[PDB]
Amino acid sequence: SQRSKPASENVYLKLLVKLYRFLARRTDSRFNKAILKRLFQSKTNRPPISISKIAALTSRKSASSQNKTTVVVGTVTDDERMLTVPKLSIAALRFTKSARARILKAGGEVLTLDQLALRAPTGSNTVLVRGKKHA
Amino acid sequence: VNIIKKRTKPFKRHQSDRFKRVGESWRKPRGIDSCVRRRFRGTISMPKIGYGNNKKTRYCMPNGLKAFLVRNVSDVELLLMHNKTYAAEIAGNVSARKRVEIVEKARALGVKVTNAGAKVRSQE
C-alpha cells in the first residue's frame, strides 16, 4: 500500500495524488515530493495529529507562531482537554467535526491539501508535521 | 510493420496424442522426473514469454486488420473512423436477416467483413 501508487480506492485521494504528481515533477520543491510520498502511505503510517499538538508544536520553545500554515497528511482530531484553541491555519487530508468547529469558531482556517497547493504550490512558509507512529 | 509470427504451430499438451482421455489443451507439466519439464533435447516445446508477438502487430489478421465482433448495425457504424485498422466479424448467432443489413452498411462505410458470405445466397 505504498511506493508507486496508493492502495486506497477513494477517487478523491487519487485526484490529490494526480495534483501532487505534477507538482513533485514540474517543481524543485522537496515539500511537494514529501507530500506525494505521504499520500501513498497506509492509514497505519499516517497517524492522526491533534489540535493540542499542532498548537504546542507551532508555539514551541521560541514560539513565534506567525502565520505559517500547518500541513499534515492525515486526520486532525480534537483535544477536548485543552480549553482555548489559538488561531491556526491547518491543511490536512481530513478534519474531525469537533476539530474543524473549534479551529473555525475561535481561530483561523481549515484547508484541504488542494487548497494548500494553490496557496503554497512550492510549500513555502509551511509547517509540515507528523503524528506519533508508535500508536 | 508487416505481420510476423514467431511461431505458427500450436502448443500441444504432452502425451495428448497417446491418450484420448488427455486433451490437447496445454497443461504445464509438474513431474520433476518428466523430461518435458526439464526441457531435454528432442522433446516438445513449452509456452514461454519469448514466443510472444510484436505489440504493434498483435491481434492482427494476415491482412493487417484486427477482428472486431459485430452483432448489429450499431456495431458496424462504430468502425467509421477505424476502417483501416479493424475488420468487422459478424457473430455466429446473428440471423441471416441481420447479416444482410450489416453487410450493406459495412459496404458503405468501407469496412472489411471477415465472413460477409455466410448464410446468404446471391441473385444478380
Binding site: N67, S89, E109, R119, A120, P121, S124, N125 | -
Partner: protein, 210 residues
C-alpha cells in the same frame, strides 16, 4: 432583482432581473455590506450561467458598466464586495468557466480606473486614488488574509497598466496607481506572490511619484 431571479435557469428572467437592477442600485440610500454581498452572490451566478462567448463578453460589459449607475456614496462598496465575492468563489470555478470570469475582473478593473477619472473632474485626483487604494488594500491586496487566491492578483498585475492606458489614451497623471502592488510585495506573507508579482506587474515609473 431579488437575487433569486438573477440566478434563474432561463436567460430571459436573468436578463429581466438585470434590467431591474439599475433602478435598485440608483437609490440615494446607504447600503450595508451584507446587502451588496447577497446581491453579488446572485450577480456572480448570472455571470456563472452565461452560455456563449458573445453573450458572456457583452454581459460582462453590462456588469462593468453598472458601476457608474451605483450611487456615489456606496460605489466603493459595490466594487469592494465584487472583489470579495470573487476571492471566495475563484477556486470553486472550473477551467471551462475561468476564461469568462477573467474578463469580468478586467472589465471591473477598468471600471475602477474610469470611475477614478470621472471623480477626478470634480475632486483632486490624489484623494480619489487614496480612496480606491484603501479599497484595494483592504480587500484583494490585503496581507492580513492568506485565503485570497494569487490568480486574481496575477491577473490584476497583468492588466493594471494596460487597462489604465485605456482610460487615459493620451497620458495618465501622476498618482499612487501601483500602491497596492508595492504594499503587498513588501509586506505579504505569501512568498510565491511577492516573488513573482514584480515579474508580472508592468509598473511604469514614468507616471508615478518618484
Amino acid at each position: 432583482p431579488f437575487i433569486k431571479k438573477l440566478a434563474a435557469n432561463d436567460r430571459k428572467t436573468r436578463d429581466k432581473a438585470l434590467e431591474s437592477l439599475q433602478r435598485f442600485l440608483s437609490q440615494k440610500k446607504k447600503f450595508e455590506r451584507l446587502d451588496f454581498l447577497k446581491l453579488w452572490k446572485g450577480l456572480f451566478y448570472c455571470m456563472w450561467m452565461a452560455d456563449k462567448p458573445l453573450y458572456q463578453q457583452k454581459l460582462s460589459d453590462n456588469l462593468a458598466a453598472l458601476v457608474p449607475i451605483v450611487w456615489i456614496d456606496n460605489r466603493i462598496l459595490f466594487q469592494s464586495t465584487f472583489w470579495e465575492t470573487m476571492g471566495r468563489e475563484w477556486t470553486g470555478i472550473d477551467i471551462l468557466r475561468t476564461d469568462k470570469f477573467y474578463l469580468l475582473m478586467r472589465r471591473f478593473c477598468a471600471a475602477a480606473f474610469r470611475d477614478i477619472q470621472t471623480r477626478s473632474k470634480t475632486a483632486l485626483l490624489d484623494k480619489v486614488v487614496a480612496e480606491y487604494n484603501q479599497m484595494w488594500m483592504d480587500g484583494p491586496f490585503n496581507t492580513e488574509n492568506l485565503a485570497f487566491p494569487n490568480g486574481i492578483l496575477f491577473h490584476l498585475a497583468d492588466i493594471w497598466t494596460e487597462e489604465l492606458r485605456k482610460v487615459y489614451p493620451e497620458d495618465v497623471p501622476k498618482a499612487d496607481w501601483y500602491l497596492p502592488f508595492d504594499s503587498t510585495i513588501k509586506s505579504s506573507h505569501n512568498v510565491v506572490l511577492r516573488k513573482t508579482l514584480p515579474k508580472r506587474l508592468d509598473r511604469v515609473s514614468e507616471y508615478t511619484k518618484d
